[PDB]
Design an enzyme around this catalytic site. Structure first.
Site, PDB file in Angstrom:
ATOM      1  N   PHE A 154       1.215  -2.217   4.555  1.00 45.75           N
ATOM      2  CA  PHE A 154       1.206  -1.955   2.978  1.00 45.75           C
ATOM      3  C   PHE A 154       0.140  -2.517   2.220  1.00 45.75           C
ATOM      4  O   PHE A 154      -0.325  -1.971   1.497  1.00 45.75           O
ATOM      5  CB  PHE A 154       2.644  -2.207   2.551  1.00 45.75           C
ATOM      6  CG  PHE A 154       3.566  -1.545   3.374  1.00 45.75           C
ATOM      7  CD1 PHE A 154       3.682  -0.083   3.104  1.00 45.75           C
ATOM      8  CD2 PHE A 154       4.570  -2.168   4.056  1.00 45.75           C
ATOM      9  CE1 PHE A 154       4.898   0.704   3.926  1.00 45.75           C
ATOM     10  CE2 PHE A 154       5.470  -1.561   4.766  1.00 45.75           C
ATOM     11  CZ  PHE A 154       5.781  -0.216   4.560  1.00 45.75           C
TER      12      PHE A 154
ATOM     13  N   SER B 110       5.388   5.312   0.399  1.00 42.82           N
ATOM     14  CA  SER B 110       5.072   5.434   1.507  1.00 42.82           C
ATOM     15  C   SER B 110       5.822   4.426   2.727  1.00 42.82           C
ATOM     16  O   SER B 110       5.429   3.375   2.684  1.00 42.82           O
ATOM     17  CB  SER B 110       3.700   5.869   2.072  1.00 42.82           C
ATOM     18  OG  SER B 110       3.851   6.152   3.574  1.00 42.82           O
ATOM     19  N   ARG B 111       6.818   4.529   3.246  1.00 40.26           N
ATOM     20  CA  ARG B 111       7.340   3.558   3.895  1.00 40.26           C
ATOM     21  C   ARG B 111       7.061   3.401   5.314  1.00 40.26           C
ATOM     22  O   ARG B 111       7.803   2.635   6.148  1.00 40.26           O
ATOM     23  CB  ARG B 111       8.995   3.557   3.941  1.00 40.26           C
ATOM     24  CG  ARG B 111       9.681   3.352   2.524  1.00 40.26           C
ATOM     25  CD  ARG B 111      11.106   3.550   2.659  1.00 40.26           C
ATOM     26  NE  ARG B 111      11.922   3.166   1.730  1.00 40.26           N
ATOM     27  CZ  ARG B 111      12.114   3.699   0.495  1.00 40.26           C
ATOM     28  NH1 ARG B 111      11.773   5.043   0.415  1.00 40.26           N
ATOM     29  NH2 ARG B 111      12.838   3.162  -0.518  1.00 40.26           N
ATOM     30  N   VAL B 112       5.948   4.236   5.688  1.00 38.75           N
ATOM     31  CA  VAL B 112       5.293   3.851   7.036  1.00 38.75           C
ATOM     32  C   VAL B 112       3.971   3.113   6.830  1.00 38.75           C
ATOM     33  O   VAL B 112       3.519   2.501   7.659  1.00 38.75           O
ATOM     34  CB  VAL B 112       5.561   5.387   7.441  1.00 38.75           C
ATOM     35  CG1 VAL B 112       4.478   5.386   9.035  1.00 38.75           C
ATOM     36  CG2 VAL B 112       6.506   6.081   7.951  1.00 38.75           C
ATOM     37  N   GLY B 113       3.297   3.618   5.726  1.00 39.68           N
ATOM     38  CA  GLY B 113       2.160   2.921   5.440  1.00 39.68           C
ATOM     39  C   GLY B 113       1.135   3.192   6.454  1.00 39.68           C
ATOM     40  O   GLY B 113       0.685   4.312   6.693  1.00 39.68           O
TER      41      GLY B 113
END
Ligand SMILES: Nc1ncnc2c1ncn2[C@@H]1O[C@H](COP(=O)(O)OP(=O)(O)OP(=O)(O)O)[C@@H](O)[C@H]1O
Ligand SMILES: Nc1ncnc2c1ncn2[C@@H]1O[C@H](COP(=O)(O)OP(=O)(O)OP(=O)(O)O)[C@@H](O)[C@H]1O
Ligand SMILES: [Mg+2]
Ligand SMILES: [Mg+2]
Lengths: 131, 321, 247, 359, 122, 72, 120, 73, 72
Positions: free
Chosen positions: E67, F2-5
């Site tokens: 991230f 986005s939680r997967v990235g």
């Protein structure tokens, strides 16, 4: 008992106490005053004003203007004026060095008008720091 | 979320208290700039006492002093006195609206306008457009002294005594009223030996006549009224002596008289800035009052509708079981 | 509230007297009816109150009336929940109300007793067809004088009195004289302060504030109107101070 | 008076004996610490404290009793405790158990303090039983009896007459609000029931004003009848001068552009808030509170930087404790700020200001 | 967060960070209305440090590398205490505010500021 | 969010747009803060320029998709 | 309002009206408290054009001739697109804002702008 | 027209005969007065007024009935 | 508002009160920027001092209606 004297700048009146002896520079160069002085209107130079009252005598630099005298009263109109003690002594001579180089880099009329007018403003500012 | 609606009221209630104390800080500053002119009032009263009598004694066509010297107007300088800070009315904008119209007028005459900018809100406007000739940028100031003014006087003096620039004119905001004070333009240089001070349009007041601004009250509000004061000129003594010459004394008086019209223009532009700000902070703190009221009403509608909707979910569940 | 009211209307109907009723306060009458109705299982009304709130209040307030025999006048304290005047408990209360007396924590700090706010207290009775024109004209001048002085407190802190206009030098001096002459000694404070109380009639009130606003009493000091009853008692305290200052 | 040991309470929001005061604020503001330091203050006074803890974590009940046993507070303290694991009947009856113990000593002529560690969790524990008993709910699903729950509890705590022996029960209920919603249903009830409220704000807790008392909104219906005569004299000036600083909070950014009549008030009010700052579990004696407010409200702290106002008063409170012990006997016995003690205190200030300036 | 548990060096800087960020939270309203120029030079200084504290509280994680896009950092407590003592004292007032964004150590914030001075020339 | 990235991306997009989410998020903080100051320095004035060019990359007409080549 | 339906000339100006009225929608918290005086040179120009767009959006109706007395005006889409081309191109920035209120064409906004400038 | 006698209605918000017109405002803003003065104006006209007071103060209705007796309405 | 505006009024009221409705449309905009301008010229200072006394037309005492001849 004497003449009273006021030295007044375009925003602030500096002196309003009775003194016995002043000696003002002028466009002639030097004028001594004692009371019962005949009324006279002179112009004053950009230089020091040495004042002798009763015991202690001190100088207040003034930056030129107009000095008229009347029936024991001296009003002096000067466009900037600083007391000779209330200028800190060496610090003017730093600012004199800021002017002395600035006339060496003076070029054109307007920089030779502005430096030489401000130099004489600064050179007669240091001469009150020592007097 | 009613917490977000309570935070909006608590910040507008904070904004109302800030913009009201800024009104009173500006109310203290226009009164302190009222006092600063009356301190300089014995100087210009005595300078006009002299300058009316040196033009009286002179009576000579041979006497030409270079601050009164009239040349041909091929170039013209314009010193504009702006504000240092924002949040003051349309003060700096209507001033540069007036500077643009004087830049425009000297292009119809075709006579090469030149700018001297004083103040941070003009330094910015003048530097930002480089296709405008500006001689020197000056730091504007609150509480102007002879020293800040002397520097302005020097640029004005040295730019005029050489023949590059004729007719140094100046536009600034005379402090006429609190909400409306139009920027009017004066012609500083060439000084008139008479000492009459006149605007570019062509109205000249006698210099023994100048008016102070005194902020007082009308019926409920805080108003300013400019009372015109006549200084009587006594007669210079018959026996009086002159030291150098009546032309050489007058050549030292006019730098005093040019320094004084600069300092009075700074102190009337200062009080106009601080009263445009007091007008702006008055209107902002009353817009924030009208806002805070309708936010308190719209909160209570949302507060009451939340409780009514919350219980009707609970009374529905209490019956449904 | 009803039990108190039933005593109040015995003195009205049978003894033909004029009674004060005091409900302290009328919001706790509302919330106690809101609690009973929730215990009785009633589906509540808007904002959680009882659905019978308009009539539970109306049952208590319509017995408080002036009959041909006597009258009962009720001065009832009012709590505003969430500082919301549109809340159904003040909104049902304020419909039945006929005057509001706002007491002020700020006016008690100055020392004014009774600390009734003059500018936020209202009435439906201060209409010129009811109190007459001589009372209605004077109550508006007193309010306009006190509202102008409330505006000028920031200007006196910036200018001072000597820089205000001459029309507004008076409306500070008169309004400072009105704020004192609104105060009054009470009979119930004769043990607490020692100064005897004064019953001031409506006839001496209007003649009091006519003299202060017409400017006849601009020679008197400020602290001649503080805790005096009548306007004659004002000049008596003043002439005492002129005889006390000379000693 | 009920001396809590905090200057912000015992001067300006004074709690007397027989008074029900409310400690209220949001979570993690210092509500327990206001109540705990009040219990820790009466080691010398002969009050009996009851600390009722409804619905708390068991780990925080053990930390309060550990705080109490170290400072000798358990020689005069009962801790009533119903941890959140317990059934809702035990949490509902826990302050009634604590109030019954405090009524025992009160009827035996003994003065008592009681603290309910959250009345909010008792109301939720009676809402639990009532909704399971199918009783019809109201605002926030509470029954109609939740006012009559807490009003039946708090009215048992007041001051008795000399015909009964003048026992007192000073209730300090603690109520937690939710995002400062004072108009929520359980804060609305207890503010109506209680005499005074002590409003604690997290915007003052993060800024350093600790204990985070919002003294402007906080009120006390007993008023100055709680305070002793020494405290009435000195805290008459603290209330006015922190009210003059409250009107000038907008002007603190603009202190230079003002006259000296206003700027000294901004300079005084910023040191009067340094008087109010106490660390946790450091309660002050009444003599130490009169010194601190006499010094601050009479011009004897205007020479100091705000970093040093805390260090000066700690050294001046330990000065008069040792060097001038005759001051404490004037205030303990006569309980009046006498012209003798006003002379004796000023001699301590000018000798401490001389020693503090050298440092 | 009590001085009997963490010592008074950790505790006095944990208060001064929270006092600085509370002070900046109160000011975000009036800098939105009236701007940064209306603040005093004391309030422009506590705004500018609270800009830099808030960035330096941020940190790249080992788990959040998909991230942040940058590698994560484990930061010790002594490195945390040393770093916030430098932002509060004013010895780092010359660095830009983005130098403190997603750095581990305070040595990483200054070395990021050297790269931002070089790439400013480039 | 986005939680997967960047696991949901190719290596080419992860090398380029691996930090673009947190750079625009930190720019949008400072653009809103740059309206609050009159005269702002060049290291801010550069980042206000680069941030407004990164916003202009992201705009598309409807149903005119960019291939991953054209996106990198 | 999609370019394959309304045309490309119609769609690019319906966007520019809405981009102008959105930007003036965002500025009504700044001008709610400080007013117009603190807005920049660009944001004042967007306020000035959007204040003229909002009045030219209004229209007299045939049905509303018994309320106001003014006759209604049918405005065709060819008149509507060119009337907002002129406000967004700025060629009618010199006209007063009340010239755009309750007129059918942009020609009637021009003829009303004369009478507000003529009558003295 | 149905003439209310109030100049602000009868010139600028004029009520016709057969129209439903709402008198809407906050408490104590003269709502009963606009209704009462409309009834008082129907003296010359052949208009029968009906006044329904729903849920009001009995003292307030008794003032209105006396004002109707006093003015022949 | 009123749905039957002009249909209700008589022809004296339709003729005379039509100039009343347009003057208060003018005077509502002239009370705005009145204190902003503060230099009221005679194209405005007349039309404001007209508009203040138009309100004095509208003030009636309670329980005293005016006949249609008196309104016109
Ligand atoms: N005067 C003070 N100075 C410094 N710290 C304090 C002070 N009072 C309390 N604290 C600290 O603040 C924290 C919260 O205080 P406390 O435990 O009393 O909160 P509380 O109001 O009971 O909140 P909760 O009900 O959520 O536990 C504690 O860690 C405590 O150490
Ligand atoms: N046109 C008027 N001129 C003078 N006084 C008036 C006028 N209209 C109303 N009043 C006064 O205003 C007060 C309020 O009016 P009124 O009671 O008619 O309004 P309301 O809104 O019905 O009140 P409520 O809502 O309390 O029943 C009355 O006491 C009346 O005397
Ligand atoms: Mg707790
Ligand atoms: Mg009614």
């Amino acid at each position: 008992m004497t003449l009273n004297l006021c030295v007044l700048t375009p925003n602030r009146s500096i002196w309003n106490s009775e003194v016995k002896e002043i000696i003002l520079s002028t466009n002639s160069g030097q004028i001594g005053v004692l009371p019962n002085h005949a009324p006279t209107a002179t112009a004053v130079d950009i230089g020091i004003l040495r004042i002798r009252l009763n015991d202690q005598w001190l100088t207040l630099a003034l930056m030129g203007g107009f000095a008229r005298i009347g029936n024991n009263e001296i009003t002096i109109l000067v466009n900037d004026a600083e007391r000779g003690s209330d200028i800190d002594p060496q610090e003017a001579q730093q600012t004199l060095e800021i002017a002395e180089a600035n006339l060496r880099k003076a070029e054109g009329k307007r920089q030779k008008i502005e430096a030489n007018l401000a130099l004489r403003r600064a050179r007669t500012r240091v001469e009150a720091s020592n007097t | 979320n009613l917490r977000e609606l309570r935070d909006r009221i608590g910040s507008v209630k904070n904004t109302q208290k800030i913009t009201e104390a800024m009104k009173l800080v500006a109310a203290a500053k226009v009164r302190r700039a009222q006092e600063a002119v009356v301190n300089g009032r014995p100087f210009s009263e005595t300078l006009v006492e002299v300058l009316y009598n040196m033009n009286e004694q002179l009576q000579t066509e041979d006497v030409d002093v270079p601050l009164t010297k009239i040349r041909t107007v091929k170039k013209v300088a314009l010193m504009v006195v702006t504000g240092d800070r924002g949040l003051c009315g349309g003060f700096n904008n209507m001033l540069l609206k007036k500077a643009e119209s004087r830049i425009a007028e000297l292009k119809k005459l075709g006579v090469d306008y030149t700018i001297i900018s004083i103040g941070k809100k003009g330094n910015t406007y003048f530097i930002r457009r480089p296709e405008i000739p500006v001689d020197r940028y000056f730091d504007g100031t609150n509480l102007p002294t002879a020293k800040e003014a002397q520097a302005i006087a020097d640029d004005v003096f040295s730019l005029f005594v050489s023949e590059e620039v004729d007719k140094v004119e100046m536009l600034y905001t005379k402090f006429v009223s609190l909400v409306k004070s139009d920027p009017v333009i004066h012609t500083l240089l060439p000084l008139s030996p008479k000492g009459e001070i006149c605007d570019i349009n062509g109205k000249c007041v006698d210099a023994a006549e100048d008016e102070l601004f005194r902020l007082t009250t009308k019926e409920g509000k805080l108003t300013v009224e400019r009372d015109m004061i006549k200084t009587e000129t006594p007669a210079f003594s018959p026996i009086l002596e002159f030291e150098q010459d009546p032309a050489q004394i007058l050549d030292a008086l006019l730098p005093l008289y040019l320094n004084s019209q600069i300092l009075r223009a700074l102190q009337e532009s200062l009080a106009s800035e601080l009263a445009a700000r007091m007008t702006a902070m008055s209107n902002a703190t009353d817009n924030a009052n009208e806002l805070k009221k309708t936010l308190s009403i719209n909160y209570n509608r949302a507060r009451q509708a939340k409780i009514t909707g919350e219980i009707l979910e609970i009374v529905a569940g209490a019956n449904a079981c | 509230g009803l039990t108190a009211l039933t005593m109040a209307e015995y003195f009205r109907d049978v003894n033909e007297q004029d009674v004060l009723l005091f409900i302290d306060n009328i919001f706790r009458f509302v919330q106690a009816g809101s609690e009973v109705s929730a215990l009785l299982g009633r589906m509540p009304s808007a904002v959680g109150y009882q659905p019978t709130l308009s009539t539970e209040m109306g049952s208590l307030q319509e017995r408080i009336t002036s009959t041909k025999e006597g009258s009962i006048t009720s001065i009832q304290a009012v709590y505003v929940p969430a500082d919301d005047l549109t809340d159904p408990a003040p909104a049902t209360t304020f419909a039945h109300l006929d005057a509001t007396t706002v007491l002020s924590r700020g006016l008690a700090a100055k020392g004014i007793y009774p600390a009734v706010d003059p500018l936020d207290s209202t009435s439906t009775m201060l209409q010129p067809r009811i109190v007459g024109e001589e009372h209605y004209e004077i109550a508006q001048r007193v309010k306009e004088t006190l509202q102008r002085y409330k505006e000028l407190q920031d200007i006196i802190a910036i200018l001072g009195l000597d820089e205000l206009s001459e029309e507004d030098r008076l409306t500070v001096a008169r309004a400072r004289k009105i704020e004192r002459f609104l105060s009054q000694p009470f009979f119930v404070a004769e043990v607490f302060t020692g100064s005897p109380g004064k019953y001031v009639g409506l006839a001496e009130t209007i003649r009091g504030f006519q003299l202060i606003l017409s400017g006849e009493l601009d020679s008197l000091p400020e602290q001649a109107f503080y805790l005096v009853g009548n306007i004659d008692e004002a000049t008596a305290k003043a002439m005492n101070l002129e005889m006390e200052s000379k000693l | 008076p009920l001396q809590t040991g905090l200057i912000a309470i015992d001067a300006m929001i004074p709690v007397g004996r027989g008074q029900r005061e409310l400690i209220i604020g949001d979570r993690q503001t210092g509500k327990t610490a206001v109540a705990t330091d009040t219990i820790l203050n009466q080691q010398g006074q002969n009050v009996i404290c009851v600390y009722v803890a409804i619905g708390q974590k068991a780990s925080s009940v053990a930390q309060v009793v550990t705080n109490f046993q170290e400072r000798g507070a358990m020689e005069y303290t009962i801790v009533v405790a119903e941890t959140a694991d317990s059934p809702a009947t035990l949490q509902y009856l826990a302050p009634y158990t604590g109030a019954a113990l405090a009524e025992y000593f009160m009827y035996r002529e003994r003065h008592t303090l009681i603290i309910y560690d959250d009345l909010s969790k008792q109301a939720q524990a009676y809402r639990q039983m009532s909704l399971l008993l199918r009783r019809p709910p109201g605002r926030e699903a509470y029954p109609g009896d939740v006012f009559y729950l807490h009003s039946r509890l708090l009215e048992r705590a007041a001051k008795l007459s000399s015909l009964l022996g003048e026992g007192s029960m000073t209730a300090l209920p603690i109520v937690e609000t939710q995002a400062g919603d004072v108009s929520a249903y359980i804060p609305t009830n207890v503010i109506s029931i209680t005499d005074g409220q002590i409003f604690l704000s997290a915007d003052l807790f993060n800024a350093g004003i600790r204990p985070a008392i919002n003294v402007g909104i906080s009120v006390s219906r007993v008023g100055s009848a709680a305070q002793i005569k020494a405290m009435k004299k000195v805290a008459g000036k603290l209330k006015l001068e922190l009210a003059q600083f409250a009107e000038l909070e907008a002007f603190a950014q603009f202190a230079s552009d003002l006259d000296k009549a206003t700027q000294n008030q901004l300079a005084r009010g910023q040191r009067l808030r340094e008087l109010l700052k106490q660390p946790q579990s450091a309660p002050l004696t009444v003599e130490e509170q009169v010194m601190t407010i006499y010094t601050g409200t009479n011009g004897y702290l205007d020479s100091l930087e705000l970093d040093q106002v805390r260090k000066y008063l700690v050294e001046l409170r330990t000065y008069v404790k040792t060097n001038k012990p005759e001051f404490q006997e004037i205030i303990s016995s006569t309980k009046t700020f006498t012209e003798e003690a006003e002379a004796l205190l000023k001699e301590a200030i000018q000798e401490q200001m001389e020693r503090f300036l050298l440092q």
